[PDB]
Paper text:
Thus, a stable mimic of the transition state (TS2) maintaining native distances between α-carbons of key residues was generated achieved by an electrophile installed between the C-terminus of a truncated UbD and a Cys replacement for K48 on UbA that was reacted with UBR5Dimer. An 8.3 Å resolution cryo-EM map of the resultant UBR5Dimer~UbD~UbA complex largely superimposed with the structure of UBR5Dimer~UbD. Local refinement yielded a 3.3 Å resolution map resolving elements defining the configuration for polyubiquitylation. In addition to UbD and UbA, the map also shows the UBA domain and additional density around the active site that was not visible in the other maps. The UBA domain binds UbA positioned with its residue 48 at the active site. With the HECT domain in the L-conformation, the UbD-linked catalytic Cys is situated not only adjacent to the acceptor but also at the junction with the N-lobe, which is thus also poised to contribute to Ub chain formation. An intermolecular hydrophobic core is formed among UBR5’s F2732, L2762, L2789 and A2790 and UbD’s I36, P37, L71 and L73. F2798, in turn, secures the UBR5Dimer~UbD active site and inserts into the interface as a molecular glue affixing UbA. UbA’s K48 is guided into the active site by interactions with UBR5’s LOL from the N-lobe, UbA binding site on the C-lobe and C-terminal tail, and by interactions with UbD. Among UbA’s lysines and the N-terminus, only residue 48 is fully buried by the catalytic assembly.
UBR5 has key roles in stem cell pluripotency, tumor suppression, oncogenesis and other important pathways. The structural data reveal a ≈ 620 kDa UBR5 dimer as the functional unit, comprising a scaffold with flexibly tethered Ub-associated (UBA) domains, and elaborately arranged HECT domains. Our data show how a full-length E3, ubiquitins to be adjoined, E2 and intermediary products guide a feed-forward HECT domain conformational cycle establishing a highly efficient, broadly targeting, K48-linked Ub chain forging machine.
Numbering used by the authors:
A (entry chain B): 2016 to 2075, 2215 to 2264, 2271 to 2312, 2501 to 2798
B (entry chain K): 1 to 75
C (entry chain I): 1 to 72
D (entry chain J): 180 to 226
The structure:
């Protein structure tokens, strides 16, 4: 049609019923989608109105907890329906872990009827329940870094412009990289099916390809914000009072050059020549073809392999009526660690046998030390406790419902972690600096044992 | 005489060792150096585990040698 | 140096233990003081059953811990 | 058997014997074993 082609329209996942959506060109990024410029507002107790802005009035069924609870009973029904297991022997490094994971994940899943996966690294007497979480965060950080690929060699992800969000690169894709893209959605599928957390983070166009929903123009704001703004003022300048005194001197075309993560350069969008100039009356065709080529054309086979790998685990009926945001909440959790929620997930088991005001003064020191701690050390402490670098967003995320306990007082004993399910053991000391030094010395170790 | 103790964070403090002592003397030396009690300690080096029943000279270790200290604390 | 092995009803027996004790010595002491056969009971330490091969140090049962007992 | 007709003493004893699992575990214990605590705890320790 014109400017109102079905690419520039808000989908069902970002609108409210009976309200006219705003115009997608006259409003900046902060006042339209406040989740684009900063992504830390995704919380379990977060309203949808403060995530996608205020809708316009028409005269001028549930939320998170309904979806995730029904999804959790459907996953445990599917889990108890099957009774075939999977054992894993991994190596705590990057290259050996990646190679061993993709050679031991081909024997399985090649629908599927797995039940439970057990994890052991090597020479470690720590076979419990946190080994699966440790394996999931190990494969996530193995595929999350950018060094190389240890044969079967470009990296499998890049960062489109926001830190922490990862989008795949083809990199002259071949018969091995496509299989490595196929066997990475299965890890996310098992994380969804076993009710855990895996630290792999994707942009919403990657997820919306996997779920089976069409990608629109507003999903480009979560991809590249500065290019979104540049094309926004290009469209607004294309409908000025004159619009020909600035497009005759800009000298654009329908040809594209690409960066190192996409390939070469000088690719024609529409055929039969790159010599056409962009007159103002087909600027929307240029914007749509540019965005659609940047998402859905160069990354066609990695996204296709990821969707095939995701549907190789689960049947194609459970992901219906599931948005990308609660998809992120069931997998990535809350992201950063908030200490108030961590206070709300404790019990204070007492076994010290001391009457220093019947305890209840050592805990103020502990919480002051925890609240006066750095963010990386906070993730280190949470990984020290539950073998996971972030906390879930609900009571139902934890199977053992974690706890700390106080031991008989020894001044020389640094704190220990019974992390095979959830528990932390803390000896009692005197004063503050002793506890500070012992705990900040203890929480830098991630090696299991016992 | 001196050994090379290394950890994850990069701390390195020299130790004094007898040329013909035992492994428990090494563990006593490192607990006296810092204050890490040896019940949570373990020494793994050169692809093998060491038990305190054998001497430090039984395992063919020279002077200014290297050793990796692993804290068995979680489980 | 005390372990309270609480039963199902609520009674509590007394034990004197060592951190270096092996489960072979556990079978030795339960045939010494008690005489109950070892193929009729199971033990719980924080939701984790022990094994005859690993010692108490491999399962982190130090001084003054909590142990359970469930008959077969 | 309705879930509310049982006292909380049995579920508290099962919790302090076996911890780290769900309320549905005690539901399946009540629906199947018909109050045989040692056999049910041995079966849940057999998995």
């Amino acid at each position: 049609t014109g400017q109102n082609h079905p690419f520039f329209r808000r989908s069902d996942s970002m609108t409210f019923l009976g309200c006219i959506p705003p115009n997608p060109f006259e409003v900046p990024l902060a006042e339209a989608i406040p989740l684009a410029d900063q992504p830390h507002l995704l919380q379990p107790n977060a309203r949808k109105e403060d995530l996608f802005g205020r809708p316009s009035q028409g005269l001028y069924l549930g939320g998170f907890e309904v979806k995730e609870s029904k999804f959790r009973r459907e996953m445990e029904k599917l889990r108890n329906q099957q009774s075939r297991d999977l054992s894993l022997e991994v190596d705590r490094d990057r290259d050996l872990l990646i190679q061993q994971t993709m050679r031991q994940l081909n024997n399985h899943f090649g629908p599927m009827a797995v039940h439970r996966v057990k994890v052991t690294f090597k020479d470690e007497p720590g076979e419990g329940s946190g080994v699966a979480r440790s394996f999931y965060t190990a494969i996530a950080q193995a595929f999350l870094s950018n060094e190389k690929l240890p044969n079967l060699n470009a990296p499998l992800f890049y960062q489109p412009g926001k830190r922490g969000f990862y989008t795949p690169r083809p990199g002259k894709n071949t018969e091995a990289r496509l299989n490595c893209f196929r066997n990475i959605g299965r890890i996310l599928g098992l994380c969804l099916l076993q009710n855990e957390l895996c630290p792999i983070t994707l942009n919403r166009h990657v997820i919306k390809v996997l779920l089976g929903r069409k990608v629109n123009w507003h999903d480009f704001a979560f991809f590249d914000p500065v290019m979104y703004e540049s094309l926004r003022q290009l469209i607004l300048a294309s409908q000025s009072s004159d619009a020909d005194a600035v497009f005759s001197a800009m000298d654009l075309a329908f040809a594209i050059d690409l960066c190192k993560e996409e390939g070469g350069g000088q690719v024609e969008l529409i055929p039969n020549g790159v010599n056409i100039p962009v007159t103002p009356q087909n600027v929307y065709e240029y914007v749509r073809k540019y965005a659609e080529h940047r998402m859905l054309v160069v990354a066609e086979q990695p996204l296709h392999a990821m969707r095939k790998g995701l549907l190789d685990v689960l049947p194609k009926n459970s992901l219906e009526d599931l948005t990308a945001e609660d998809f992120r909440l069931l997998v990535n959790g809350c992201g950063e660690v908030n200490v108030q929620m961590l206070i709300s997930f404790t019990s204070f088991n007492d076994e010290s046998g001391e009457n220093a005001e019947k305890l209840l003064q050592f805990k103020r020191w502990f919480w002051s030390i925890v609240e006066k701690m750095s963010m990386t050390e906070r993730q280190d402490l949470v990984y020290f406790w539950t073998s996971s670098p972030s906390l879930p967003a609900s009571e139902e995320g934890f199977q053992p419902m974690p706890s700390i306990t106080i031991r008989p007082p020894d001044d020389q004993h640094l704190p220990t972690a019974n992390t095979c399910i959830s528990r932390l053991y803390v000896p009692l000391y005197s004063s503050k600096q002793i506890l500070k030094q012992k705990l900040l010395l203890a929480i830098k170790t991630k090696n299991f044992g016992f | 005489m001196q050994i090379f103790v290394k950890t994850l964070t990069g701390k390195t403090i020299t130790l004094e060792v007898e040329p013909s002592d035992t492994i428990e003397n090494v563990k006593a030396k490192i607990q006296d150096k810092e204050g890490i009690p040896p019940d949570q300690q373990r020494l793994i080096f050169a692809g093998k585990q060491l038990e305190d029943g054998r001497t430090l000279s039984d395992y063919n270790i020279q002077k200014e040698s290297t050793l990796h200290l692993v804290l068995r604390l979680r489980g």
